[PDB]
């Protein structure tokens, strides 16, 4: 039965994401904040995609890094072909959805990956942060406040539901995000921001002693 085989793939993909560590992304006063539980120092789950578009993922590394690379490729080819301000988080999210659907139906094994594409406004501009979550099948969801990916998402999502506050500063949003993530030191956290105040490249990692001071 095709429907039973599809349930076999849906189930397969859900279990792999559960094996992966958790990631959260939430809106705060200066933009968007990515906080992931990541022990390695070389392997990363948060990345710049374009000037104002960031990316977080949770699942099999050799696949969401494949998607990371494809997305970078796409964004730069568009930006050069048209212009930088034409590439938007919405296009990127849509491409990931088409690609994960095609993979989910056509390839042997479905990517066990969960994606979050984030976008902030340009410099000196005003607009609310946009978060999109793309799941393994191709489904895409528009999130107003925060996205939680990988592992057991219920307790983290609820803790964030109680603690979230719009226009929280960088330090408060970091405390809320680490707290809800616990439901970890600088040696087990990957933290980055989409700082809306930067002139062009908004993505910026917060590591080491600066991260130490913030948390």
């Amino acid at each position: 039965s095709p429907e039973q085989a599809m349930r076999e793939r849906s189930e397969l993909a859900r279990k792999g994401i559960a094996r992966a560590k958790s990631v959260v992304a939430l809106a705060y006063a200066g933009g968007v904040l990515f906080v992931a539980e990541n022990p390695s120092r070389s392997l990363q789950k948060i990345s710049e995609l374009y000037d104002r578009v960031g990316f977080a993922a949770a699942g099999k590394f050799n696949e969401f890094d494949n998607l990371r690379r494809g997305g970078i490729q796409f964004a730069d080819t568009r930006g050069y072909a048209y212009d930088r301000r034409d590439v938007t988080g919405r296009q990127l999210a849509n491409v990931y959805a088409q690609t994960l659907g095609t993979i989910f139906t056509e390839q042997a094994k479905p990517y066990e990956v969960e994606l979050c594409v984030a976008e902030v406004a340009h410099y000196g501009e005003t607009k609310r942060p946009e978060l999109y979550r793309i799941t393994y099948d191709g489904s895409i969801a528009d999130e107003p406040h925060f996205v939680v990916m990988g592992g057991t998402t219920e307790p983290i999502a609820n803790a964030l539901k109680e603690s979230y506050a719009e226009n929280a500063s960088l330090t408060d949003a970091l405390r809320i995000a680490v707290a809800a993530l616990r439901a970890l030191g600088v040696a087990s956290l990957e933290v980055a921001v989409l700082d809306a105040n930067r002139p062009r490249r908004a993505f910026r990692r917060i590591t080491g002693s600066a991260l130490q001071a913030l948390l």
């Binding site: 990363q44 990345s47 710049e48 970078i72 730069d76 490249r201």
Partner: protein, 222 residues
């Protein structure tokens, strides 16, 4: 066209004029020829305007692309190499009269001594490059007059500001002896553009500073 670059104790400065011609006819009074390709480099391009702006754009894209894929910028050596390969790639069109020569200024964060981490690199039409040691370089139709001016003026360079003044003056002499290079237009208020790179990155010199320096030079000569 004329683009000068000079190292000073602790950094590098790069300035360029504003004129663009077609034969004897002045076609552009406010072109910007010096770009900030990334947080630690700036690129001037002399020559055909199209090929110039295109080089700058594409090179910036490539630097930043590798940076996003690998999570770390190339070393200054790698940057030099990629720029050289682009230049070598335009060689056929350069012999067809679409020549564009880049001058690359950078601040090496990995260098040992911070006071001499400044870097100036020059290219020919055949993609070969050369790291400059005499502390200054220039490119364009006015480059010889600019270099011969900086040779004498360069003992005065002791910091970021004095280095900036020397840059502006070298441009003034290029323009003074060559008609294809525009000098400071006091009437319309258009001045050379300048970029300063030091330990903290690359910033554009705001116009007012260049205006004051130009007025000081002009009063000094009259």
């Amino acid at each position: 066209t004329t683009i000068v670059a000079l190292k000073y104790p602790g950094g590098v400065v790069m300035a360029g004029d504003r004129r663009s011609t077609q034969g004897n006819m002045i076609s552009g009074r406010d072109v910007r020829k010096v770009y900030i390709t990334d947080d630690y480099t700036a690129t001037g391009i002399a020559g055909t305007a199209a090929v110039a702006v295109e080089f700058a754009r594409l090179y910036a894209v490539e630097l930043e692309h590798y940076e996003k894929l690998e999570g770390v910028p190339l070393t200054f050596a790698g940057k030099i190499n990629r720029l050289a390969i682009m230049v070598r790639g335009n060689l056929a069109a350069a012999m067809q009269g679409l020549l564009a020569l880049p001058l690359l200024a950078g601040y090496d964060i990995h260098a040992s001594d911070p006071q001499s981490a400044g870097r100036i690199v020059s290219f020919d039409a055949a993609g070969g490059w050369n790291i400059e040691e005499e502390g200054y370089q220039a490119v364009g139709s006015g480059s010889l007059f600019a270099k011969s001016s900086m040779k004498k003026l360069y003992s005065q360079v002791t910091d970021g500001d004095s280095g900036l003044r020397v840059a502006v003056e070298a441009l003034y002499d290029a323009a003074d002896d060559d008609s294809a290079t525009g000098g400071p237009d006091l009437v319309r208020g258009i001045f050379p553009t300048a970029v300063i790179i030091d330990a903290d990155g690359a910033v554009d010199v705001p116009e007012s500073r260049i205006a004051e320096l130009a007025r000081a030079i002009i009063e000094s000569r009259s």
